[PDB]
């Protein structure tokens, strides 16, 4: 950011960026700000790009200090409003600089370091990569079974698929909390519940998708959805199944259509769905050729099903480095 | 405590108090401890009573400091283990000094300042007085009705006494949380829920009884019990009805017997029940004579009911200062 501030030494801006620069120079905090090396003096309105980028540097500093404290200890005294909280609270001031530069005939300048920076921000965000959480279905099954046993209502394990679907649906559309603090938990059970609490405690733009290994029925996706909602995951992430064994690839389109049939999920999925297609285990239990061909059929029929339900499908290819995977 | 430390200058103790004083002088924290004015030097095992009472002063000092912080700000860094947390963790060392003194033929000394102190602790505890929480039944009903309405299960208001009873019982004996953070609350609703949260945050020996104004049915007491359990009140306080209007005094023995009829409540009540008897409103809506007489009969029949159910009843007489109350 300091190198970018050095280059954005222009003085022409449109009335927009001038107004905003006046805003920042208003709350300029006439202080020494000696923790910085460069630009430790309050930036003058002569060079307005440097003013706005100056506020951007302050919010970066405080974001770094907050993350470093949050990591090094368990907590941080750094105020959240002093940091970039949004993926675009960061982007906004840079967008403004770009609009101003183009407005003032400086598109060549704007397409330089400022553009590089814009693409880095829009591409990498506040957390360099979005993290996926992958876990096998049977662990979610164990969790739910502990819950239904504890609620004196049966055993989710022993329940047929239809019973699982109806119950999960009723609990997702219901308004009463499920388990409480007093739920008996295995180390595994508490592992997955705690991972959900960890996901809820953390920023939304840090995570990607929750991938369910050995997914076979909608009860598994709905299970993860309910387990998220009940772990108070404020902005729950998209759930995606992983079909890797060959039989799962044969049965996959049927299962996806049956999932989209659920009006609730089709309404909350918001027209977009991702499903992972594994390449590792297919050519292991059956013929490599049979695996490749069945994969082709799988992609084809998955797209068919998604178009049939008016949902934008993006398929996740779990390819390896070796041709055998 | 310092004056007590000064008088307890004996050198004879039994082996019990000797062992303990040696323990305390072991972890004596060989430091300056200059915040105290008197006894700032590590107390020598020569004066064992002073060793023990000296530790008592450390725990009192830290208890006062924690209480003062907890009051003046919202929180305290003072570790809880440094304080007296139990109303008798305090009593123990003093009991020990008393036992030791009597062992050594010093019962007279034990019956001086030490005894006064024992009685002051055992009578006033860590919180000078135990605080009652009183609220009228209709407010608990409003809360419950908001919950049953929000849970799309009906209207607690419109429900018969029997329906209220069966539902409350099922919820008391159930293990699932009731409402969540998303329960719509009036300012009154959130008032009573918040008082329960305040009760849960605070120590148990700080509170006494929860008095229900306008109590008429077991549903009212069961209601307060459920609201305590659901507000995570770890050690819920005893619920006690208040009969003050003349009709309520007439119906009181019946309503109290009807309460004891619920085996669930009678088994949890631990053989003890308190019920309040108001003296203010009776001689206002009827005569003073009719009210006095009805109060007498009411006490009589209440005792009969409690003896029939093997419950030790203690009655709370809300007498005023004027004869008319
Ligand atoms: Cl119980």
XYZ file of C-alpha atoms and ligand atoms in Angstrom:
651
model
C 0.000 0.000 0.000
C 2.843 2.443 0.661
C 4.303 2.018 -2.823
C 0.818 2.527 -4.256
C 0.414 5.688 -2.157
C 3.712 6.974 -3.522
C 2.579 6.521 -7.107
C -0.939 8.047 -6.710
C 0.458 11.574 -6.534
C -2.146 13.154 -8.827
C -4.006 16.327 -7.902
C -6.952 16.195 -10.341
C -10.040 14.321 -9.208
C -13.746 14.521 -9.821
C -16.123 16.154 -7.331
C -16.822 12.701 -5.850
C -13.275 11.796 -4.801
C -12.688 15.407 -3.735
C -15.724 15.273 -1.437
C -14.605 11.959 0.047
C -11.028 13.198 0.458
C -12.439 16.197 2.332
C -14.341 13.728 4.538
C -11.159 11.831 5.414
C -9.099 15.005 5.923
C -11.890 16.108 8.279
C -11.411 13.162 10.670
C -7.705 13.257 9.822
C -6.566 12.803 13.450
C -3.895 15.529 13.512
C -1.350 13.313 15.277
C 2.272 12.273 14.880
C 1.388 8.731 13.736
C 5.058 7.870 14.181
C 4.495 4.111 13.944
C 4.642 4.453 10.160
C 7.942 5.162 8.456
C 6.643 7.045 5.423
C 3.755 9.515 5.284
C 3.753 9.887 9.034
C 2.583 13.483 8.599
C -1.127 14.096 8.011
C -1.599 13.884 4.253
C -2.566 17.205 2.606
C -5.646 17.601 0.426
C -3.279 18.665 -2.395
C -2.882 14.984 -3.370
C -6.355 13.516 -2.773
C -5.560 10.002 -3.995
C -2.927 9.932 -1.263
C -5.532 11.006 1.316
C -7.994 8.244 0.430
C -5.242 5.654 0.093
C -3.975 6.976 3.427
C -7.186 5.942 5.154
C -6.863 2.624 3.298
C -3.405 2.163 4.846
C -4.703 2.935 8.335
C -7.462 0.343 7.986
C -4.942 -2.166 6.652
C -2.598 -1.546 9.597
C -5.398 -2.108 12.075
C -6.603 -5.199 10.189
C -3.104 -6.711 10.324
C -2.706 -5.860 14.011
C -6.110 -7.334 14.820
C -5.427 -10.587 12.963
C -1.916 -10.893 14.439
C -3.234 -10.427 17.979
C -6.225 -12.729 17.382
C -3.714 -15.347 16.211
C -0.863 -14.819 18.695
C -3.200 -14.585 21.693
C -6.866 -15.577 21.756
C -8.329 -12.098 21.471
C -7.761 -8.560 20.295
C -8.482 -5.094 21.676
C -8.359 -3.659 18.117
C -11.776 -2.130 17.289
C -13.543 -3.817 14.400
C -14.638 -0.498 12.878
C -10.953 0.462 12.595
C -10.473 -2.526 10.235
C -11.832 -3.743 6.912
C -14.743 -6.030 7.797
C -16.265 -6.275 4.294
C -14.699 -7.836 1.193
C -15.358 -4.455 -0.441
C -15.157 -1.942 2.348
C -11.614 -2.525 1.083
C -12.650 -2.393 -2.585
C -14.786 0.785 -2.335
C -11.985 3.412 -1.909
C -9.933 1.823 -4.693
C -12.970 1.737 -6.995
C -13.443 5.436 -6.222
C -9.817 6.190 -7.120
C -10.261 4.299 -10.383
C -13.461 6.155 -11.317
C -11.750 9.463 -10.567
C -8.656 8.573 -12.607
C -10.677 7.516 -15.642
C -12.963 10.547 -15.281
C -9.886 12.770 -15.395
C -8.405 11.109 -18.476
C -5.977 8.918 -16.536
C -7.164 5.448 -17.582
C -3.531 4.599 -18.530
C -2.514 5.421 -14.949
C -5.507 3.598 -13.486
C -4.665 0.467 -15.499
C -1.281 0.239 -13.732
C -0.464 -0.423 -10.082
C -3.975 0.627 -9.011
C -5.485 -1.972 -11.349
C -3.017 -4.647 -10.226
C -4.093 -3.850 -6.658
C -7.804 -3.918 -7.524
C -7.415 -7.347 -9.122
C -5.431 -8.594 -6.137
C -8.155 -7.416 -3.733
C -11.076 -8.698 -5.804
C -9.214 -11.976 -6.383
C -7.709 -12.722 -2.951
C -9.984 -10.830 -0.543
C -9.411 -10.565 3.194
C -8.319 -14.222 3.490
C -6.073 -15.390 0.651
C -8.165 -18.531 0.025
C -11.660 -19.708 0.924
C -11.506 -22.874 3.017
C -13.646 -25.938 2.330
C -14.680 -28.277 5.154
C -14.922 -31.940 4.105
C -16.334 -34.642 6.380
C -17.963 -38.015 5.825
C -21.721 -38.410 6.016
C -21.707 -41.130 8.684
C -20.276 -38.659 11.204
C -23.216 -36.308 10.682
C -25.407 -39.404 10.981
C -23.825 -40.229 14.358
C -24.438 -36.651 15.539
C -28.098 -36.715 14.581
C -28.521 -40.171 16.148
C -27.097 -38.893 19.431
C -29.624 -36.060 19.216
C -32.697 -38.203 18.472
C -31.708 -40.776 21.082
C -31.238 -38.010 23.646
C -34.583 -36.440 22.676
C -36.293 -39.818 23.326
C -37.611 -39.844 19.757
C -35.862 -42.812 18.123
C -32.608 -43.535 16.324
C -31.804 -41.535 13.201
C -29.456 -44.358 12.146
C -32.248 -46.961 12.071
C -34.605 -44.534 10.325
C -35.465 -44.979 6.667
C -34.498 -42.260 4.221
C -38.055 -40.901 4.092
C -38.218 -40.584 7.881
C -34.873 -38.769 7.908
C -36.074 -36.362 5.186
C -39.400 -35.560 6.874
C -37.777 -35.015 10.279
C -34.894 -32.902 8.976
C -37.355 -30.769 7.016
C -39.608 -30.237 10.031
C -36.622 -29.180 12.139
C -35.188 -26.810 9.496
C -38.523 -25.022 9.040
C -39.257 -25.085 12.778
C -38.272 -22.328 15.181
C -37.320 -24.228 18.356
C -33.631 -24.926 19.194
C -32.611 -28.555 18.842
C -30.010 -29.792 21.308
C -28.842 -27.898 24.338
C -25.674 -27.606 26.374
C -26.629 -30.939 28.011
C -26.348 -33.101 24.894
C -24.165 -36.188 25.488
C -21.304 -36.058 22.989
C -18.612 -38.473 21.834
C -15.199 -37.038 21.008
C -16.161 -37.443 17.345
C -19.609 -35.888 17.825
C -18.134 -32.962 19.745
C -15.479 -32.708 17.032
C -18.032 -32.005 14.317
C -20.278 -29.800 16.475
C -17.222 -27.836 17.575
C -16.091 -27.405 13.964
C -19.511 -25.885 13.302
C -19.074 -23.516 16.264
C -15.620 -22.628 14.922
C -17.196 -21.877 11.539
C -19.862 -19.691 13.168
C -17.344 -17.770 15.278
C -15.281 -16.834 12.187
C -15.852 -14.495 9.220
C -18.080 -15.691 6.406
C -15.747 -14.706 3.561
C -13.053 -16.967 4.981
C -14.864 -20.226 4.122
C -15.970 -21.889 0.919
C -18.037 -25.085 0.786
C -18.842 -27.977 3.114
C -18.112 -31.176 1.205
C -19.845 -34.356 2.391
C -17.881 -37.537 1.777
C -19.793 -40.704 0.879
C -22.972 -38.726 0.302
C -25.818 -40.921 -0.880
C -29.142 -39.303 0.032
C -30.627 -35.832 0.554
C -30.793 -36.670 4.273
C -27.028 -36.056 4.346
C -27.139 -32.552 2.820
C -30.183 -31.580 4.857
C -28.394 -33.016 7.878
C -25.428 -30.708 7.383
C -27.775 -27.764 6.743
C -29.679 -28.331 9.991
C -26.447 -28.946 11.908
C -25.204 -25.583 10.631
C -28.383 -23.684 11.488
C -28.469 -25.208 14.949
C -24.826 -24.318 15.568
C -25.895 -20.680 14.978
C -23.777 -20.323 11.823
C -24.985 -16.821 10.967
C -24.341 -17.074 7.197
C -24.279 -20.828 6.482
C -22.085 -22.013 3.637
C -23.215 -24.026 0.643
C -23.339 -27.812 1.093
C -21.913 -30.031 -1.660
C -21.825 -33.851 -1.976
C -18.812 -35.915 -2.996
C -19.573 -38.982 -5.118
C -16.362 -40.916 -5.609
C -17.169 -44.633 -5.595
C -18.438 -45.853 -8.954
C -21.882 -46.911 -7.705
C -22.284 -43.431 -6.198
C -21.514 -41.981 -9.639
C -24.171 -44.212 -11.213
C -26.755 -43.239 -8.580
C -25.744 -39.567 -8.380
C -28.158 -37.923 -10.891
C -31.123 -39.654 -9.236
C -30.037 -38.344 -5.832
C -29.559 -34.791 -7.115
C -33.000 -34.766 -8.722
C -34.511 -36.095 -5.496
C -32.758 -33.315 -3.582
C -34.016 -30.586 -5.940
C -37.530 -32.051 -5.531
C -37.453 -30.749 -1.946
C -39.126 -27.368 -2.393
C -37.453 -25.984 0.751
C -33.901 -26.733 -0.353
C -34.575 -25.640 -3.939
C -35.826 -22.303 -2.567
C -32.876 -21.785 -0.203
C -30.234 -22.994 -2.677
C -30.995 -19.852 -4.733
C -30.579 -21.382 -8.194
C -26.908 -22.347 -7.744
C -25.545 -25.785 -6.884
C -22.087 -27.333 -6.794
C -21.435 -31.065 -6.559
C -18.020 -32.711 -6.373
C -17.020 -35.599 -8.627
C -14.164 -37.710 -7.275
C -11.548 -39.314 -9.508
C -9.404 -41.116 -6.927
C -11.452 -44.158 -5.887
C -13.303 -44.764 -9.184
C -10.444 -46.329 -11.142
C -9.488 -48.311 -8.029
C -12.425 -50.674 -7.515
C -13.452 -50.891 -11.189
C -11.780 -50.600 -14.560
C -10.081 -47.291 -15.281
C -11.984 -47.250 -18.593
C -15.354 -48.015 -16.999
C -14.618 -45.297 -14.447
C -13.835 -42.620 -17.056
C -16.913 -43.473 -19.135
C -19.193 -43.515 -16.094
C -17.752 -40.136 -15.100
C -18.668 -38.748 -18.526
C -22.221 -40.062 -18.143
C -22.283 -38.587 -14.638
C -21.401 -35.052 -15.758
C -23.872 -35.318 -18.625
C -26.853 -36.451 -16.546
C -26.028 -34.080 -13.683
C -26.222 -31.153 -16.098
C -29.473 -32.617 -17.445
C -30.958 -32.695 -13.928
C -29.787 -29.188 -13.022
C -31.284 -27.731 -16.201
C -34.463 -29.713 -15.498
C -34.809 -27.856 -12.167
C -33.568 -24.499 -13.489
C -30.492 -24.548 -11.253
C -27.015 -23.415 -12.307
C -24.758 -26.440 -11.782
C -21.013 -26.097 -11.308
C -19.226 -29.432 -10.954
C -16.132 -29.892 -8.778
C -13.593 -32.290 -10.309
C -11.439 -34.018 -7.703
C -8.605 -34.743 -10.143
C -5.126 -35.835 -9.111
C -1.689 -35.539 -10.662
C -1.368 -39.127 -11.830
C -3.555 -40.328 -14.691
C -4.641 -43.160 -12.387
C -6.366 -40.523 -10.250
C -10.614 -9.568 60.757
C -7.444 -7.728 61.801
C -8.690 -7.143 65.346
C -9.560 -10.823 65.421
C -6.007 -11.596 64.263
C -4.641 -9.465 67.113
C -6.570 -11.227 69.837
C -5.936 -14.783 68.582
C -2.336 -14.730 69.778
C -2.292 -18.138 71.513
C 0.571 -20.615 70.977
C -1.269 -23.877 71.855
C -3.350 -25.542 69.160
C -4.335 -29.100 68.403
C -2.546 -31.151 65.799
C -5.322 -30.406 63.288
C -4.959 -26.618 63.314
C -1.192 -27.110 63.528
C -1.160 -29.135 60.338
C -3.222 -26.545 58.548
C -1.142 -23.616 59.759
C 1.951 -25.445 58.536
C 0.196 -25.861 55.165
C -0.565 -22.155 54.930
C 2.925 -21.093 55.985
C 4.222 -23.477 53.298
C 2.521 -21.530 50.481
C 3.054 -18.398 52.549
C 4.232 -16.432 49.495
C 7.443 -15.096 51.047
C 6.787 -11.578 49.731
C 6.558 -8.056 51.115
C 2.706 -8.042 51.004
C 2.883 -4.340 51.866
C -0.698 -3.490 50.865
C -1.848 -4.350 54.373
C -0.760 -1.923 57.083
C -0.692 -4.341 60.014
C 0.705 -7.874 59.824
C 2.557 -7.156 56.606
C 5.297 -9.641 57.557
C 4.710 -13.321 56.839
C 3.020 -14.574 60.016
C 5.209 -17.088 61.882
C 3.911 -20.533 62.703
C 4.486 -19.566 66.366
C 1.007 -18.035 66.412
C -1.001 -20.639 64.481
C -4.378 -18.994 64.889
C -2.838 -15.857 63.374
C -1.472 -17.932 60.499
C -4.935 -19.253 59.678
C -6.803 -16.010 60.250
C -4.149 -14.291 58.167
C -5.088 -16.434 55.205
C -8.727 -15.619 56.007
C -7.800 -11.961 55.545
C -6.214 -12.699 52.182
C -9.449 -14.341 51.010
C -11.594 -11.561 52.495
C -9.432 -8.864 50.884
C -9.733 -10.587 47.506
C -13.490 -11.169 47.962
C -14.018 -7.473 48.704
C -11.830 -6.507 45.736
C -13.747 -8.799 43.361
C -17.139 -7.602 44.618
C -16.067 -3.970 44.339
C -14.821 -4.474 40.780
C -17.863 -6.500 39.776
C -19.990 -3.566 41.018
C -17.982 -0.542 39.897
C -17.193 -1.930 36.421
C -18.940 -4.922 34.917
C -16.239 -7.517 35.457
C -13.210 -8.507 37.482
C -9.796 -9.997 36.778
C -9.651 -11.227 40.412
C -9.474 -15.042 40.326
C -12.428 -16.714 41.967
C -10.226 -19.193 43.847
C -8.755 -16.236 45.743
C -12.197 -15.456 47.224
C -14.779 -17.031 49.481
C -17.265 -18.467 47.024
C -19.309 -20.558 49.478
C -21.153 -19.163 52.485
C -19.104 -21.628 54.565
C -15.788 -21.922 52.829
C -15.599 -18.796 55.004
C -16.986 -20.588 58.056
C -14.544 -23.531 57.895
C -11.274 -21.925 59.112
C -13.164 -20.210 61.931
C -14.778 -23.508 62.923
C -11.244 -24.936 62.988
C -9.979 -22.173 65.307
C -12.944 -22.789 67.588
C -12.351 -26.584 67.716
C -8.650 -26.081 68.410
C -9.279 -23.531 71.156
C -11.744 -25.786 72.911
C -9.302 -28.708 72.598
C -6.711 -26.668 74.479
C -9.020 -25.638 77.312
C -9.607 -22.195 75.815
C -13.347 -22.395 75.271
C -13.680 -18.979 77.018
C -11.434 -17.338 74.438
C -13.320 -19.101 71.652
C -16.585 -17.677 73.029
C -15.413 -14.070 72.696
C -14.634 -12.228 69.467
C -14.296 -15.520 67.591
C -17.838 -16.591 68.486
C -19.346 -13.206 67.638
C -17.585 -13.548 64.289
C -18.861 -17.085 63.724
C -22.418 -15.957 64.346
C -22.006 -12.919 62.087
C -20.805 -15.077 59.201
C -23.350 -17.823 59.713
C -26.181 -15.256 59.974
C -25.200 -12.681 57.320
C -23.117 -14.827 54.963
C -21.364 -13.444 51.922
C -24.429 -11.329 51.052
C -25.910 -9.485 54.014
C -29.466 -10.495 53.134
C -31.038 -12.986 50.776
C -33.071 -11.139 48.135
C -36.587 -12.127 47.071
C -37.802 -11.619 43.501
C -41.542 -10.866 43.281
C -43.579 -10.669 40.072
C -47.242 -11.026 39.173
C -48.535 -14.195 37.527
C -49.899 -12.476 34.417
C -46.367 -11.496 33.407
C -45.126 -15.079 33.485
C -48.235 -15.973 31.485
C -47.477 -13.256 28.891
C -43.959 -14.668 28.477
C -45.179 -18.243 28.059
C -47.865 -17.129 25.593
C -45.239 -15.362 23.504
C -43.291 -18.637 23.514
C -46.192 -20.921 22.556
C -47.343 -18.436 19.916
C -43.844 -18.179 18.475
C -43.430 -21.951 18.608
C -46.623 -22.182 16.533
C -48.148 -24.461 19.157
C -51.103 -22.406 20.427
C -51.861 -19.730 23.031
C -50.897 -20.293 26.650
C -53.353 -17.513 27.603
C -56.348 -19.167 25.954
C -55.367 -22.545 27.424
C -57.343 -24.164 30.220
C -55.585 -24.825 33.492
C -55.312 -28.498 32.558
C -53.724 -27.777 29.164
C -51.220 -25.425 30.802
C -50.389 -28.137 33.360
C -49.803 -30.984 30.906
C -47.708 -28.797 28.617
C -45.567 -27.309 31.383
C -45.010 -30.779 32.842
C -43.899 -32.201 29.510
C -41.484 -29.293 29.083
C -40.090 -29.552 32.615
C -39.432 -33.269 32.172
C -38.207 -32.794 28.603
C -34.548 -32.241 27.781
C -34.890 -29.937 24.729
C -34.362 -26.158 24.952
C -37.513 -24.088 24.628
C -37.069 -20.662 23.041
C -33.964 -19.334 21.357
C -32.330 -15.936 20.855
C -34.931 -15.204 18.150
C -37.984 -15.113 20.445
C -39.972 -11.893 19.864
C -40.172 -10.068 23.195
C -42.164 -7.150 24.508
C -40.291 -4.824 26.841
C -42.125 -6.599 29.670
C -41.353 -10.087 28.325
C -37.676 -9.231 28.001
C -37.945 -7.664 31.462
C -38.845 -10.953 33.141
C -36.562 -13.068 30.960
C -33.726 -10.666 31.717
C -34.391 -10.817 35.457
C -33.994 -14.567 35.194
C -30.694 -14.134 33.338
C -29.486 -11.739 36.025
C -30.445 -14.375 38.597
C -28.447 -17.000 36.709
C -25.343 -14.779 36.447
C -25.336 -14.143 40.175
C -24.416 -16.342 43.150
C -27.113 -18.535 44.638
C -26.687 -17.448 48.211
C -27.470 -13.934 47.066
C -31.154 -14.735 46.374
C -34.019 -16.013 48.514
C -37.498 -16.816 47.158
C -39.442 -16.019 43.969
C -42.864 -14.730 45.012
C -45.781 -14.951 42.576
C -48.429 -12.279 42.976
C -52.017 -13.216 42.024
C -51.227 -16.920 42.136
C -54.297 -19.151 41.697
C -53.261 -22.465 40.125
C -50.349 -24.917 40.007
C -49.738 -23.709 36.466
C -48.323 -20.471 37.928
C -45.690 -22.116 40.099
C -44.838 -24.666 37.406
C -44.555 -21.705 35.027
C -41.935 -19.955 37.137
C -40.103 -23.266 37.591
C -39.915 -23.804 33.837
C -38.847 -20.220 33.195
C -35.995 -20.691 35.675
C -34.888 -23.991 34.158
C -34.983 -22.531 30.638
C -33.101 -19.371 31.602
C -30.214 -21.641 32.685
C -30.684 -20.803 36.374
C -28.356 -23.520 37.682
C -29.762 -23.514 41.261
C -33.353 -22.307 40.821
C -34.934 -20.527 43.729
C -37.957 -21.787 45.583
C -41.266 -20.578 44.182
C -43.811 -19.257 46.646
C -47.374 -18.063 45.977
C -48.805 -14.924 47.537
C -52.480 -14.954 48.518
C -53.591 -11.481 49.474
C -57.094 -10.698 48.192
C -59.907 -12.188 50.252
C -61.036 -14.599 47.526
C -57.431 -15.713 47.111
C -57.214 -16.354 50.856
C -60.352 -18.477 50.600
C -59.078 -20.431 47.589
C -55.514 -20.665 48.856
C -55.672 -24.018 50.724
C -57.376 -25.616 47.732
C -54.822 -24.208 45.283
C -51.887 -25.270 47.441
C -53.258 -28.794 47.810
C -53.812 -28.879 44.064
C -50.132 -27.949 43.672
C -48.900 -30.684 46.040
C -51.054 -33.117 44.014
C -48.575 -32.926 41.142
C -46.158 -35.648 42.231
C -43.433 -34.166 40.016
C -43.434 -30.892 41.922
C -43.903 -32.511 45.327
C -40.919 -34.780 44.725
C -38.660 -31.943 43.618
C -39.797 -29.628 46.449
C -37.653 -31.529 48.976
C -40.298 -31.703 51.696
C -40.433 -27.912 52.047
C -42.935 -25.310 50.840
C -43.342 -21.636 51.680
C -46.452 -19.632 50.816
C -47.028 -15.943 51.435
C -50.100 -14.521 53.153
C -50.789 -10.846 52.526
C -52.434 -8.654 55.159
C -52.827 -5.375 53.200
C -55.601 -5.973 50.674
C -57.896 -8.257 52.740
C -59.389 -5.683 55.077
C -59.823 -3.261 52.152
C -62.209 -5.196 49.891
C -63.976 -6.824 52.875
C -64.106 -5.740 56.507
C -61.129 -5.806 58.832
C -62.904 -8.405 61.001
C -63.866 -10.670 58.095
C -60.315 -10.336 56.743
C -58.616 -11.137 60.056
C -60.865 -14.164 60.535
C -60.310 -15.365 56.975
C -56.550 -15.022 57.434
C -56.759 -17.207 60.550
C -58.872 -19.879 58.835
C -56.507 -19.738 55.845
C -53.441 -20.467 57.960
C -55.332 -23.312 59.638
C -56.364 -25.046 56.424
C -52.967 -24.492 54.788
C -51.241 -26.320 57.627
C -53.804 -29.156 57.358
C -53.050 -29.451 53.631
C -49.270 -29.490 54.133
C -49.451 -32.085 56.930
C -51.625 -34.286 54.726
C -48.943 -34.156 52.000
C -45.984 -34.599 54.331
C -44.664 -31.146 53.429
C -43.152 -28.830 56.031
C -44.954 -25.595 55.334
C -43.496 -22.296 56.442
C -45.790 -19.309 55.920
C -44.587 -15.820 54.992
C -46.700 -13.180 56.727
C -46.848 -9.907 54.790
C -47.872 -7.806 57.778
C -47.592 -4.027 57.682
C -47.022 -1.530 60.445
C -50.567 -0.220 60.778
C -53.251 -2.445 62.316
C -55.301 -1.933 59.125
C -52.528 -3.739 57.243
Cl -35.281 -33.050 37.107
